Amino acid sequence: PQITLWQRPLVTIKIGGQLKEALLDTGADDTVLEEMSLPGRWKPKMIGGIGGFIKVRQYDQIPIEICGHKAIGTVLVGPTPTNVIGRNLLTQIGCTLNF
C-alpha cells in the first residue's frame, strides 16, 4: 500500500498471536514495543532516543506480522512511549520512502 503522512502511520501488527497498533518509523534503526511477554532468552541493549537512553530486552528471530506482511526479526521490549516499527523490520516487508 501507499501511506501518506498527514496522519501518524499507525498500523496493526500481530505478535505472539495478539494484535497491537504500531508506528512505521523510518527514523528508527530498531523496533521497540511496550512491555509484553515473548519466548526464549533475551539480551540487554541500551538505545538512544530524543529524550535520552533507556534499557530494553532484546529478543531475536521473533515472528511478527505488519499490515499482513510476515517478518521474523529482532524485537526490543521496554519503556517506550509508543510501539515503533523500525528499519530492521520495514526492510523485511519491502518498505521504501518515495517522493
Next chain:
Amino acid sequence: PQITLWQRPLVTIKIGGQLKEALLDTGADDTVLEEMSLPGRWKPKMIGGIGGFIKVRQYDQIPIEICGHKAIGTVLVGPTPTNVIGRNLLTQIGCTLNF
C-alpha cells in the same frame, strides 16, 4: 526518488541559509534540529520520544528545502541528539511510505 531503508534515510536540507543533514522520519510528528539560529518569534515547547522529553524553541512558517523540494512549516530547535525531518514537512514534499 525512491529511498531504500537498508540505511538511515539521510538527506541534505537548506534552512536559514545553512545546509544540514537530517533524517527523514515518518514516525516524527515534528521536525526538530540541533541548536541553530532562526529568524522571527518563537515559543517554548516540550517534546517527547524514547527516553523522555526535551525543551525546544518552536519557530513557525520557516522556509526549508529538502532534496530540491521547497516547503514551509514549523521547525523545533533544541538539544536533540540528531536532526529529524518530521511528517509536518514530509507531507509538503509529497513523501509517502510504500510496500
